[PDB]
Design a protein around this ligand. Structure first.
Ligand SMILES: *Cc1c(COP(=O)(O)O)cnc(C)c1O
Ligand SMILES: *Cc1c(COP(=O)(O)O)cnc(C)c1O
Lengths: 788, 788
């Protein structure tokens, strides 16, 4: 029987050393998860054999924002009810058990969450795709709050038994740096799939020292000396995205990237020679996707392995490399385009450096023969001015270079990677981002899932979201609209319970849930959102505004540790919350909620209850926007600029089913040219009272002086050099106009609102990562569905 | 049952692959989980039963636990079932058993005694719980490089270890003045043959309050970020960490305080859940202090009672004096712990105040008692800024015991004469013993079968005295025949074991002459080696040929900084090379140095042993637990009249053992006029042997170590001779006796078997079941408490 109490009890007893009913919630979670592993073990192996005989894809990424695994696995295996039954039968409540698990701290943001959605979409379609990354022990950082200020701490997640990562020490490899010999210990994480028996794999690497510690130093009682090398190796997997302002920090970033790409390629080669005679046909059977530039060292490293360990010539090796790697670009701008001092490579791995230098030497000669001028070659070369340009190695080696949305792909063709598109137009293509309908709809919004399943006649939509388009006809069915309003309300009722229990705040389950969950960045304009709230505070308390629906403004963000104004903005939001939440004359109509330590789990609780999706980055700064897509699938309406994902959302539902505003990306150069923010400060009604509220003592920054800095970052200067880089004051008037209008349509036309929401839901199939993966798989990787 | 279906379930969960495809490591893991699942209920029942009873809490800085799987399977009577299930699932049990590293939780005899005690306690249903540290890397792993001992870390739980269960939710705090630490409790099950009771070894793991200094990490001060994390980790990193410097000493004291404080806090917690308060703590609890390592428990309990539970000093000390019992193990007072009081003042000021108050009160109480200032100063816990831990123990303990009749008389008369004169009622004797489960029933199934067949039941397994009535078969050739066949099979097993372990080929028909002791000069491995070198020349040059072939086996680790001991190990490896590689001698004589001697190696050696070398200088050994293990397995004792050999010969008679050398009462006169140089020139063949040490026969690698050894033997006169342990003085009698013993082995095989049989049948005297029964009724005052 599927997940009987007897089986679950057995695994729990083994973990707790006590009968299953007396076990702690922690030990029960461990037992239950072991039960799941037991049940898929067979399928997992069959999948391994199936994929092993097929052409494969290997997705390299410096991050995988996996979130929790238990509910997701139970859902995809269709065992939630049995688990519920088994657990209660053994004296526990499944809802409590699920809370035991911390989000796997293996990723940071969108880049990582995309890689995660891709893995789920791949197995759901039986595509032989294996993921490869680092087993970060403490994630990015855990966010807490002290007196309203963000505090960063380690983010452990696997300090306790974690059955969803299996250690394979007997399969360990060596990654030797010129100054450090390391063990690379492989871990296996199972990727389950709704509606299939296939179980994919996410391979995570953990660095361990050659020797546990320096016993001689220890025995001499030089205790710190004894563990320095141990902890320097441990630093490779300690945290994600370690700060790199110093040389040593930069060298660690490069260590991290070489570590998991070298280990991954070695294991891939191992596996290949266990299924094939030699490597000469490596590229027929393997492709590797480079998610951004983090994994680009894989390229010189595959050359090294092929030539140094399998006696292959340069020409044959490069031929394999140029047919193996594909490369995904994520932003419109150079900027973040990784660049490393060549000296780091020379010091960490001299042989790999020689290969990088040979790549650059050959590249220049090949270009000169192509007939290019020296100025163009110099600015394309992988090595220039003592610096190695990782994106140029990627563009040179990759057989495919893709953007992640129609507009973004065109910019990289025309600007960012213009010289590359000029030489090799054929490499460029587009692959629009998307999210997985499983975790972000079916798993988190059963209420909505039910209705979709009743209407459409099956749950085929779970793995083929386009099926929902068929339901746009009901947009006029009033009984259905009412059901959808009731689903949203039930979700909001749930959210209020969750937030009350989590942070002790009481909110109105009937108010509008206006949500902005995004990394804190000035170009994200959480600050603009904050202003609007502050102004609205004053329009209610001093201006007598009352003909408006109550609303709860929800925030979720981390700020980078050294990003001063980002942390100041988070502090500002917390102070504004304190002001409006404790003012009886305003709390009835406006409350602010800052969700602490925003991550996958919090997102799962927020999205289903969301009404308004704030996507207000400055036009031209967002290439994509996957959270935008998740909101759409859950019945939340988009309030945003004509940038990134909003473009495609509006394109699908129409201007009438969304709230777009602000300057367009083509208008801004002229606006910034003669920008007069200080005048807006003095002129735009309310704005002066709003911004002054930052340093007249209305708000409290606890003597930090942060609010006054923010204020003058917005009003100081003028023209293209104005301090308000992200046109916050410039768009505020149009932003407030639209946000106000949106809240109005909300109190006055409930059915009309529910209708727009339905249109969004039914058209959201366009943003499913299943379509994205199909496209990667058919156009770039050239894969076939491979059932186990 | 332990059915294949159950084991496969647990293996699949651990391996993420069908059981038959799992690696041996994963299979071992799953099989161990299967065992835990099976005893979980009996374990909880024992917890409840012991908790309602008067209990004993055994405090020890070491527990030499060895491997747990085979021991548990044997005590649960599931070896046959486990063997079949494993084979049914594609694996072989022996291969699986070999995967487990000995749990590096102990050092030597002191730790093994604590382990045997835990087993004997559960076998008799006595409510005894063990408390220690969860050492992560043991003492050290021994390896060899060009004949020299090399020391490295000894990991054992880097891989999942299902036999230690983490209880993070029950964690406590141990605050040092310079370090707030988390005390994570771990539970290890102690199974018992013939009973359903399952005892507990509680092991504590120190973890940092914060994972690491995130602020320093972000600043890219990578070493600074983990200094404090690793200082806390040092608490459980290594056992008996070198303490030649103040810092090493402070670490030892930190380790002792950590596990005592945590244990007492947990004991108090548990007491307050069965009783209204701590006024009757001593009525329901007893704490055995195994040597002086856990003495800080005394002041710490005082601190807890007064500082956390509002008791006054008088009441608190009353409880303490009826709670603690102290066990003394040696005849010398130079090993008794003494610490600079500054260490205490720095680690825990409050605890130091209490220790000072203990000294202050002690002096006044003894002055009241009428002792003179001289005696008081010499008994005080604090003298000249040094805290004498043994004095705190003798002052607080209600019981002070020795570990052998003679040893106990010596400490009454000498070692602790001041305390015996003051409180004669505290002193008593509890002779050490070993468990017949791990050391006979589990490792020698061949002999166990014969014993069970002859006696008609396996009652002897938990009542070894039962074998006495079998002594009469000493004259039955059918039995002796079986005895010899069993030894022969055991030796063949060992020969296979060593061949696979170190590639050395040995003759299963030769005499297995074994010495497995820690390397100490008083242990006299050197005399053994001298005899081997001489024998080499006798065979090579003196035409010796009327002798049986023999394999001389050594097992021994040397303390890292002990130069003579390490020189001796090198010498043994040198002689072995000289001997094993000479075609004129190898066929008769081979030397085997078993690398990294520990519990598992002993378990393979003992059953195959013919000769038990117990040759320490008379007067040096108080006990001799290894001596007992050899006896139980049919090996004859070649040793001095000292320690366990006395009692052994007392039980079997001088005709069934080979005692030699100077008795302890003769040595004072012998040494007074000791002339090692004369012996060097006169004992036949000796000069040739010793000269081989520096004439080029044996290679020092030009270290001059052999020369120093040679000189340490032949230099000086009388009380100032360098041969402090009468190595040359005993050599003549040693060689004669050892030569005689070999002659008997080959001339009277059945007579040899007879002697072996009498040893085996009389071994019940050394069962730790008798030792524990005596602790429990005379000191701890326990009653058998069955779980079911
Ligand atoms: C979906 C998701 C993201 C991506 O969000 P964007 O800001 O739209 O790039 C990041 N973090 C979490 C927790 C998410 O679930
Ligand atoms: C039994 C045992 C001991 C104790 O023996 P000694 O005679 O005191 O040296 C120490 N170590 C191991 C591995 C043992 O099994």
């Amino acid at each position: 029987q599927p997940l009987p109490a007897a089986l679950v009890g057995s695994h729990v007893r083994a973990a707790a050393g006590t009968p299953a009913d007396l076990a702690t919630d922690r030990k029960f979670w461990t037992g239950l998860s072991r039960a799941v592993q037991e049940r898929i073990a067979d399928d997992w192996e069959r999948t391994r054999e199936a994929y092993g005989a097929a052409r494969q894809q290997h997705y390299f990424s410096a991050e995988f924002l996996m979130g929790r695994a238990l509910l997701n696995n139970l859902t995809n295996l269709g065992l939630v009810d049995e688990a519920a039954a088994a657990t209660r039968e053994l004296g526990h409540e499944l809802t409590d058990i699920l809370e035991i698990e911390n989000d796997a701290a293996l990723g940071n943001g969108g880049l990582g969450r995309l890689a995660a959605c891709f893995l789920d979409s791949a197995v759901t379609q039986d595509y032989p795709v294996t993921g490869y990354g680092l087993l970060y022990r403490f994630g990015l950082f855990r966010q807490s709050f002290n007196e309203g200020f963000q505090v960063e701490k380690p983010d452990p997640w696997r300090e306790e038994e974690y059955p969803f990562t299996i250690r394979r020490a007997s399969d360990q490899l060596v990654v030797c740096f010129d100054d450090m010999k390391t063990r690379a210990i492989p871990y296996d994480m199972p990727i389950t799939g709704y509606g299939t028996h296939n179980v994919g794999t996410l391979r995570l690497w953990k660095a361990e020292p050659w020797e546990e510690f320096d016993y001689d130093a220890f025995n001499a009682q030089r205790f710190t000396d004894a563990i320095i090398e141990r902890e320097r190796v441990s630093d490779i997997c300690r945290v994600l995205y370690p700060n790199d302002t110093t040389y040593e920090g930069k060298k660690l970033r490069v260590r991290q990237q070489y570590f998991f790409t070298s280990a991954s390629l070695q294991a891939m080669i191992q596996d290949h020679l266990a299924h094939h005679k030699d490597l000469s046909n490596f590229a027929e059977f393997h492709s590797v996707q480079l998610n951004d530039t983090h994994p680009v060292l894989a390229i010189p490293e595959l050359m090294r392995l092929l030539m140094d360990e399998h006696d292959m010539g340069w020409e044959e090796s490069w031929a394999i490399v140029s047919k193996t790697f594909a490369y995904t670009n994520h932003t419109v701008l150079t900027e973040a385009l990784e660049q490393w001092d060549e000296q780091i490579f020379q010091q960490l791995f001299w042989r790999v450096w020689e290969i990088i230098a040979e790549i650059d030497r050959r590249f220049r000669l090949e270009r000169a023969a192509d007939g290019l001028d020296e100025e163009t070659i110099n600015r394309m070369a992988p090595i220039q001015h003592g610096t190695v340009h990782m994106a140029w190695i990627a563009c040179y080696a990759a057989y495919s270079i893709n953007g992640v949305a129609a507009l973004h792909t065109e910019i990289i063709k025309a600007e960012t990677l213009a010289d590359w598109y000029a030489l090799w137009p054929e490499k460029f293509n587009n692959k629009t981002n998307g999210v997985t309908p499983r975790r972000w709809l079916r798993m988190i919004n059963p209420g909505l899932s039910d209705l979709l399943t009743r209407l459409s006649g099956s749950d085929d939509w779970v793995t083929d979201l386009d099926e929902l388009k068929k339901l746009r006809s009901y947009a006029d069915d009033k009984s259905v609209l009412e059901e959808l309003r009731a689903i949203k309300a039930a979700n909001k009722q749930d959210f209020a319970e969750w937030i009350l229990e989590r942070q002790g705040i009481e909110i109105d389950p009937e108010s509008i849930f206006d949500v902005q969950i995004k990394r804190l960045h000035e170009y994200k304009r959480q600050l603009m959102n904050a202003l609007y709230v502050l102004d609205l505070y004053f329009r209610i308390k001093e201006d007598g505004l009352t003909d408006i629906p109550a609303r709860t403004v929800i925030f979720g963000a981390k700020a980078a540790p050294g990003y001063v104004r980002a942390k100041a903005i988070i502090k500002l939001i917390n102070s504004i919350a304190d002001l409006v939440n404790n003012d009886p004359e305003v709390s009835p109509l406006l409350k602010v909620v800052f969700v602490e330590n925003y991550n996958v789990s919090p997102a799962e609780h927020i999205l289903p209850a969301s009404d308004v999706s704030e996507q207000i980055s400055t036009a031209g700064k967002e290439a994509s926007g996957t959270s935008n897509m998740k909101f759409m699938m859950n019945g939340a309406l988009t309030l945003g600029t004509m940038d990134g994902a909003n473009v495609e959302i509006v394109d699908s539902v129409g201007e009438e089913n969304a709230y777009i505003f602000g300057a367009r990306v083509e208008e801004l150069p002229a606006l910034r040219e003669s920008y007069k923010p200080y005048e807006l400060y003095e002129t735009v009604p309310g704005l002066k009272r709003a911004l002054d509220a930052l340093d007249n003592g209305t708000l409290n920054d606890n003597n930090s002086g942060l609010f006054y800095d923010l204020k003058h970052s917005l009003i100081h200067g003028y023209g293209k050099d104005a301090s308000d880089t992200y046109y916050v004051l410039g768009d505020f008037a149009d932003y407030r106009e639209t946000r106000d209008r949106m809240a109005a349509d909300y109190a006055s036309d409930p059915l009309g609102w529910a209708r727009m929401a339905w249109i969004n839901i039914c058209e959201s199939g366009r943003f499913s990562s299943d379509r994205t993966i199909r496209d990667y798989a058919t156009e770039i990787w050239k894969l076939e569905p491979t059932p186990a």
